[PDB]
Specification:
The structure is cut from a larger assembly and holds seven protein chains of seven kinds. Chain B is mainly α. Helices cover 34% and strands 4% of the residues of chain B. The chains are: A alpha/beta, B mainly alpha, C alpha+beta, D alpha+beta, E mainly alpha, F mainly beta, G alpha/beta. The complex binds NADPH dihydro-nicotinamide-adenine-dinucleotide phosphate, the ligand CCCCCCCCCCCCCC(=O)SCCNC(=O)CCNC(=O)[C@@H](O)C(C)(C)COP(=O)(O)O and zinc ion. It is classed as electron transport.
Chain lengths: 208, 134, 126, 86, 114, 95, 297
């Protein structure tokens, strides 16, 4: 499996599994899962009441020093009752490593803002307000960042349509750019592309 | 002429020969000015001044449950009892059996392809009939 | 305490930005999609799907393209169980109808049945 | 101006429909012999409550819930429906 | 059924926040009609504010009306600070849109929508 | 082989022409309806049928990897020629 | 009814209204808002233009792709008129000049060109024809404008018997020459009574006259809701505009009172409510700034 297959990094896998055990046993109040991917990325799935105590740990602890917040992300998964999956990506420049801190909320439960840990989060979770509708409590300036000013709805939710509900055009009667319900001259064509044969037997879920 | 919708053009309850009620779904919309059929009847009732107590398809199906409650329980065969009572009722009139033989109207494959107004308008059914009649 | 008690029904229709016409006139359909009979694979029958009723698609006068005015005409949602899809429809105020999962009932397969002594289940050729 | 059709809805297995079942097992035939030109539509369903719909002239439909009745109570309500014609 | 709140513990604090947001909008409307030089009256804009508050009047969940108050404060902040233009303020008034058919018969006449 | 409707409009290789009472001819008023006058159905009819002495022929449309996927055509029917599904060149067994 | 002209959609920009409209004079003031309200339904609007194509640019965002067909025409070329109307199911006329020019007088613009458009539209099979006269059109009128417009109205009525002829009183709006005339005159006050009509009311009346089949052969009088004297109207214009090119034909028409024609229907019989002057005069005259309403009768 040399030329076309990605080489497995067992050293980093062992080190990240050990540090995942380390974080899981220092903070058992909030750590719910710890997993390491086959391409060696550590995920620490925590409880949403421990957003600040976990992230302040990894930023400040001398065996962690995750001083950089690379990215902050939500993922809409509507089949869960807590549909939004808040993803922190952290970079330790000291130990040359990356960690992922995952948590969850629904539309109505607020998540605590992590600007007290990473000021970088000030826009990112604000984008999570704009795109997903997740509210962040004790945020300095929480408002929209990317959508238009009168925009109704949160676009990256998966029940939100691809084109929106409204569209703009200039109207010379009122001398104004106006919004109207969206009509497309050509509809977006939906492609059912998924093959009915199982692609990956390792990821098979057990039946009912 | 009141142009209506076809079975691919409306959500619509059809009941098969075993009693199972089943709903179609709107695949395409009716062409031109043609509308859904009960929409036409309901609009005719409102023009005539004898307006009917339904506006949406769900209210039509509430009416349809009022008339018989098994026309809204879809993909369900509701069992029908009381064979003995219909047997007792059928003995009242002594209707005579005619001497004509039992002949079904569809004897060969020639008679199968064109039965209703969709199949008679179908050029594929026309080629099937032309293929089996030679 | 730090936890409140809300015994109301979960409803978020005022927060999703969806207009009224695309909440209270749409019929979501919650269903396991059937296997394509062009194929024998069954990986597309594994999850539940939520779609909506089809609205009018008309002809573009310039090109003949399929013009639509339904924003929800391409929205297909994936759910692991029936109850998750029902909860997501009820949460968004979508009136829905549910079709039960139609698994194929198990068959009785015997290769020797093709060559029986007295039964009609012989194959006339192989 | 007059009664046009009668609709009797009931269940196959519910106990509340039992007397209604006892009305049709015993007392429908001499009902139907008494009213040959009257549609009396018996509709059994899975989990419905017993019910008696009477459509009168010009679309008027009266309704009598027959839940937890005996056969005699169904007989009295149905003969009130027949003698009513309202 | 034990959930974590946003700001309000029950519906009374929630209605208090709704009421103060309504006060802020009601005070802001003449300033908005002046500095965006809108062609509506002050009474017409205040009727639109009353309409936008009565549209959400059916809600009994404290978290949902807390988010409605938060989004109303965001819209007010986009209004007071001139972040909206005249167009974003006048999108509440669907003025280029033709009036939709309401009864059964006109909806029958125009098309297939229920 | 372009032809012409009674409206004077050219009919394409599809067979598309607007009706006389169709308003959408007004888009060609003062302008032109761009049609292509090289009909491929007539141009592949101009090609001669290739007499080959084999039973199964292979066609790739010429040019090697500049034609189409290479297919194999059976020539056991003598009433019908063996037409390639991609390029339309039709073949015949000479015996 | 042909399959391409059946209406489809929800009445938006990409919809189909089934209105194939030839608007003569779309490059002016009424044609601006008329092509706006037609194209926002999804109507095939044919714009025959006489002017530079640059002066038609504002008509281009008013509809979907291919839903506005611009083409050349001449008022003295019936072939160009036939080339413009031979596919339309409605023809609207809006050709007008407040002033007569070297190559066109009022007899050319109001009599010859509308009769040519209506005759060619009759002999091309156009279903609906709409003519736009003036409310004060009279044979015995003092101004040449209204005399030739009464003559042209009579000719349009006798060569297209189903022509919906419309009588606006004095159309005000943004690009008007009525309130912008009064705000830039810095003539006088007499016993002249006017009820000016708003341009969006006129446009809704024209399109509801297209949509009403009963408006064929009718004659409508599009008037405003409030009748004003000339003097307090002009004082209201100078009160809103924050103030302390002409010919004598315009002087005769400003001092010509807007007549009352109760035997003719108006905006209300097409389903249009008339918008009063005070709700739109600030919108019109805000441009002229560097208020107690007028007295009605
Ligand atoms: N206040 C008002 O506007 C009122 C108007 N009316 C009537 O309504 C009609 C339209 O009014 P309105 O828009 O205001 O007037 P405009 O002068 O603004 O518009 C007239 C239109 O006709 C065109 N046109 C003018 N003269 C000729 C000609 N000789 N040959 C070809 N095209 C020509 C112009 O095009 P181009 O730019 O190329 O010159 C323009 O598109 C007129 O008949 C007018 O009398 C009636 C009552 C009130
Ligand atoms: C110019 C345009 C300006 C546009 C402004 C848009 C602002 C939109 C803000 C909307 C914010 C809301 O809708 S919060 C309202 C939700 N409240 C509820 O659901 C609780 C019910 N509320 C009520 O009944 C309210 O009438 C009161 C006043 C809180 C209590 O009344 P009840 O007692 O009888
Ligand atoms: Zn080939």
């Amino acid at each position: 499996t040399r030329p076309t297959v990605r080489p497995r990094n067992d050293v980093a896998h062992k080190q990240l599994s050990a540090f995942g055990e380390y974080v899981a046993e220092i903070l058992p109040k909030y750590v719910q899962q710890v997993q390491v991917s086959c391409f060696s990325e550590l995920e620490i799935c925590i409880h949403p009441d421990g957003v600040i105590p976990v992230l302040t740990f990894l930023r400040d602890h001398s065996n962690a020093q995750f001083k950089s917040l690379a990215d902050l992300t939500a993922v809409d998964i509507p089949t869960r009752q807590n549909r939004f999956e808040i993803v922190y990506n952290l970079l330790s420049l000291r130990f040359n490593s990356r960690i992922r801190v995952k948590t969850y909320t629904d539309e109505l439960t607020p998540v605590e803002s992590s600007v007290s840990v990473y000021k970088a989060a000030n826009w990112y979770e604000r984008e999570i307000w704009d795109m997903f509708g997740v509210f962040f409590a004790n945020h300095p300036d929480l408002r929209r960042i990317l959508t238009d000013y009168g925009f109704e709805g949160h676009p990256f939710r998966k029940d939100f349509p691809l084109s929106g509900y409204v569209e703009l055009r200039y109207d010379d009667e009122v001398k104004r750019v106006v919004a109207e319900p969206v009509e497309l001259a050509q509809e977006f064509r939906k492609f059912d592309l998924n093959s009915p044969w199982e692609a990956f037997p390792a990821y098979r879920q057990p039946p009912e | 002429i009141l142009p209506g919708a076809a079975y691919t053009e409306k959500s619509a309850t059809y009941v098969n020969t075993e009693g199972r009620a089943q709903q179609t779904k709107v695949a395409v919309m009716p062409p031109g000015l043609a509308r859904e059929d009960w929409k036409i009847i309901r609009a005719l009732s409102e023009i005539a001044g004898m307006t009917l107590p339904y506006d949406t398809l769900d209210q039509v199906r509430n009416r349809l449950e009022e008339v018989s409650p098994n026309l809204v329980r879809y993909d369900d065969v509701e069992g029908a009892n009381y064979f003995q009572q219909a047997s007792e009722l059928s003995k009242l009139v002594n209707q005579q059996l005619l001497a004509d033989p039992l002949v079904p109207p569809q004897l060969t494959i020639k008679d199968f392809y064109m039965t209703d107004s969709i199949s008679r308008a179908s050029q594929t059914m026309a080629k099937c009939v032309k293929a089996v009649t030679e | 305490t730090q936890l409140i008690t809300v015994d109301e029904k979960l409803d978020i229709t005022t927060l999703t930005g969806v207009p009224e016409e695309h909440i209270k006139t749409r019929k979501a359909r919650i269903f396991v999609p059937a296997r394509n009979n062009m194929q024998s694979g069954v990986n597309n029958t594994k999850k539940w799907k939520m779609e909506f009723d089809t609205r009018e698609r008309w002809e573009n006068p310039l090109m003949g393209w399929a013009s639509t005015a339904d924003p929800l005409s391409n929205l297909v949602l994936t759910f692991s169980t029936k109850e998750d899809a029902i909860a997501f429809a009820e949460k968004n105020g979508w009136s829905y109808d549910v079709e039960e999962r139609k698994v194929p009932k198990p068959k009785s397969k015997s290769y020797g049945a093709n060559f029986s002594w007295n039964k009609r289940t012989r194959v006339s050729t192989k | 101006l007059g009664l046009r059709e009668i609709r009797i809805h009931l269940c196959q297995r519910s106990p509340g429909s039992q007397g209604v079942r006892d009305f049709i097992e015993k007392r429908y035939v001499e009902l139907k012999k008494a009213n040959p030109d009257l549609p009396i539509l018996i509709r059994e369903c899975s989990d419905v409550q017993p019910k008696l719909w009477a459509r009168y002239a010009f679309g008027q439909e009266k309704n009598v819930s027959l839940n937890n009745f005996s056969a005699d109570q169904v007989t009295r309500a149905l003969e009130n429906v027949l003698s009513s014609k309202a | 059924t034990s959930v974590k709140p946003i700001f309000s513990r029950d519906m009374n604090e929630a209605k208090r926040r709704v009421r103060e947001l309504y006060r802020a909008w009601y005070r802001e409307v003449p300033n908005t009609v002046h500095l965006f030089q809108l062609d509506i009256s002050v009474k017409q804009g205040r009727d639109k504010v009353r309409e936008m508050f009565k549209k959400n009047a059916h809600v009994t969940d404290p978290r949902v009306v807390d988010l409605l108050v938060i989004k109303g404060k965001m819209e007010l902040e986009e209004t007071i600070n001139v972040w909206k233009q005249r167009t974003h303020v006048m999108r509440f008034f669907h003025e280029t849109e033709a009036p939709r058919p309401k009864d059964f018969l006109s909806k029958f006449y125009v098309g297939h929508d229920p | 082989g372009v032809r012409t409707s009674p409206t004077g409009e050219k009919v394409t290789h599809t067979g598309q022409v607007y009706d006389d009472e169709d308003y959408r001819r007004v888009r060609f008023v003062g302008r032109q309806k761009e049609v292509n006058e090289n009909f491929a159905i007539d141009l592949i009819a101009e090609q001669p049928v290739s007499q080959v002495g084999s039973r199964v022929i292979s066609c790739d449309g010429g040019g090697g990897a500049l034609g189409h996927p290479r297919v194999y055509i059976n020539l056991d029917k003598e009433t019908k020629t063996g037409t390639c599904g991609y390029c339309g060149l039709q073949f015949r067994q000479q015996h | 009814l042909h399959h391409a002209v059946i209406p489809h959609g929800k009445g938006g920009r990409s919809s189909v209204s089934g209105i194939v409209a030839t608007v003569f004079g779309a490059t002016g003031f009424l044609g601006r808002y008329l092509v706006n309200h037609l194209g926002r339904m999804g109507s095939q609007v044919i714009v025959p233009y006489r002017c530079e194509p640059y002066d038609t640019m504002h008509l281009r965002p008013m509809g979907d792709l291919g839903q506005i067909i611009f083409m050349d025409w001449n008022g003295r070329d019936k072939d160009s008129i036939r080339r413009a109307v031979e596919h339309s199911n409605v023809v609207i006329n809006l050709v007008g000049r407040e002033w007569e020019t070297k190559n066109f007088d009022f007899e050319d613009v109001f009599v010859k060109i509308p009769q040519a458009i209506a005759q060619v539209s009759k002999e091309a099979g156009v279903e609906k024809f709409i003519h736009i006269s003036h409310l004060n059109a009279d044979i015995k009128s003092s101004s040449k404008y209204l005399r030739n417009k009464a003559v042209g109205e009579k000719e349009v009525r006798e060569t297209f018997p189903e022509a919906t002829i419309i009588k606006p009183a004095d159309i005000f709006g943004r690009e008007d020459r009525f309130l912008n005339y009064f705000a830039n005159i810095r003539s006088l006050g007499k016993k002249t009574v006017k009820q000016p009509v708003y341009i969006v009311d006129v446009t809704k009346g024209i399109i509801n006259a297209i949509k009403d089949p009963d408006a064929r052969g009718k004659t409508f009088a599009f008037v405003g809701p409030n009748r004003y004297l000339l003097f307090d109207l002009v004082q209201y214009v100078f009160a809103v505009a924050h103030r302390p090119w002409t010919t004598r034909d315009k002087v005769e028409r400003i001092h010509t009172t807007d007549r009352t024609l109760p035997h003719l229907p108006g905006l209300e019989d097409l389903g249009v409510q008339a918008t009063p002057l005070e709700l739109k005069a600030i919108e019109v005259l805000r441009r002229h700034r560097t208020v107690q309403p007028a007295k009605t009768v």
